């Protein structure tokens, strides 16, 4: 995400603080430094997909919640108002198009925003391939059991 931004004058130290991780006293530097392009892996659909989600979310939940409040849901309507107007406190001033939407447009918005999720299904979960039961001395190898 932050490799695409320019004009941060702390960009080198902030990439360095991202690349240095530590876990049980073994450091490693994540080799995706300044975009050397050796194998950056470039992850461009992954960041694009995340930001499509975080941009198409508020207006989709807005167009759903602005409808059928007469029924006693009683929890969802209150929660969305709170969650939306805390972060996006000044909600929809200029409005872009001033509430001229198509039902087909809303259809395409929800269909797209749900395609993005089930296609970022890969970075969604991480399965446990092995559950290690014991580890040999000096941490050379370990006997595990196999799952998934």
């Amino acid at each position: 995400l932050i490799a695409v931004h320019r004009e941060y004058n702390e960009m080198q130290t902030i990439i360095d603080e991202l690349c240095s991780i530590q876990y049980r006293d073994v450091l490693i530097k994540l080799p995706d430094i300044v975009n050397d392009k050796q194998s950056m892996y470039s992850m461009k659909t992954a960041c694009i997909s995340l930001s499509m989600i975080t941009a198409m979310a508020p207006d989709i939940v807005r167009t759903y919640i602005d409808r059928l409040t007469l029924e006693d849901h009683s929890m969802l309507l209150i929660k969305c108002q709170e969650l939306l107007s805390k972060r996006t406190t000044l909600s929809t001033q200029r409005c872009g198009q001033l509430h001229a939407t198509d039902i087909k447009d809303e259809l395409k918005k929800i269909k797209s925003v749900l395609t993005m999720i089930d296609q970022i299904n890969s970075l969604t979960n991480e399965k446990t391939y092995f559950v290690v039961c014991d580890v040999s001395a000096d941490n050379r190898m370990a006997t595990c059991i196999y799952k998934n």
Partner: protein, 269 residues
């Protein structure tokens, strides 16, 4: 227009300016401004005050109730925000969590019902939960909210509204610096708006009742003084100024009493 009586053009211009800038000046009460009444009193003493000031103060109270009824703002705009806050925050918090105060949610549903006086009764008891969430291990605190200068300025604003119902200003207590939580600031909003709404309606009904009681009293005294004469103009003035007056009636009656001022200036001796 602007019929009043045998008063001077100076006094008619004074009453014009007063009933125009009624919404402008503060402490709107005809008892609190006695200069209107001694502008209303008639030149050359009580020999012509003894009937004409009865008629003229009758005209003052009629047009005062008229300009109140014509210039009341609509406080349902602030009760709409009361319904939004009381609905969205209170019921839904006590349903979403802490499912013991549903008896108090039935109480706040009856508070949503238009029983404001009994509703604002036990605003202490529905403030105690806001005290519990603003400060841990719940104590009793003063009834107005957490910030001290905002607490004093709320009371200053409520006294301003109680003096002048016609011109009122909301306080809009919300803050971006929030040591106090969001939901309990919404509770603070609800308490302030509920007090503002009930204060405006109490003071409005108070001055309306006072004006109508003064109108009925001046009718009784003025009919008692007009009783003795049996000329046709005098008994027609009796039958006009004897007609019953309610608040929905007073505006049509002011039109009637203009078209009868055309006679009852000359009908009075």
């Amino acid at each position: 227009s602007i019929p009043f009586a045998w008063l001077d053009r100076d006094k008619v211009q004074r009453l014009t300016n007063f009933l125009s800038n009624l919404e402008n000046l503060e402490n709107v009460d005809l008892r609190e401004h006695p200069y209107v009444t001694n502008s209303c009193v008639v030149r050359e003493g009580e020999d012509v005050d003894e009937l004409k000031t009865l008629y003229n103060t009758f005209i003052l109270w009629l047009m005062y109730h008229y300009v109140l009824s014509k210039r009341k703002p609509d406080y349902n705009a602030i009760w709409q925000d009361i319904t939004k806050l009381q609905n969205v925050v209170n019921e839904y918090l006590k349903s979403k969590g802490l499912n013991k105060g549903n008896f108090e949610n039935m109480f706040t549903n009856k508070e949503k019902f238009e029983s404001q006086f009994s509703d604002i009764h036990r605003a202490l008891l529905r403030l105690g939960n806001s005290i519990r969430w603003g400060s841990n291990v719940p104590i009793d605190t003063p009834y107005v909210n957490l910030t001290a200068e905002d607490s004093s300025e709320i009371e200053n604003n409520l006294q301003d509204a109680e003096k002048n119902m016609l011109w009122y200003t909301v306080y809009n207590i919300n803050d971006p610096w929030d040591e106090n939580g969001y939901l309990v600031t919404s509770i603070n909003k609800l308490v302030y708006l509920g007090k503002l709404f009930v204060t405006l309606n109490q003071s409005w009904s108070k001055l309306e009742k006072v004006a109508m009681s003064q109108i009925v009293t001046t009718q009784n005294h003025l009919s008692g003084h007009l009783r003795k004469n049996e000329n046709f103009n005098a008994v027609y003035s009796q039958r006009v100024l004897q007609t019953p007056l309610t608040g929905q009636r007073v505006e049509s009656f002011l039109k009637i009493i203009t078209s009868d001022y055309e006679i009852i200036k000359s009908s009075l001796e």
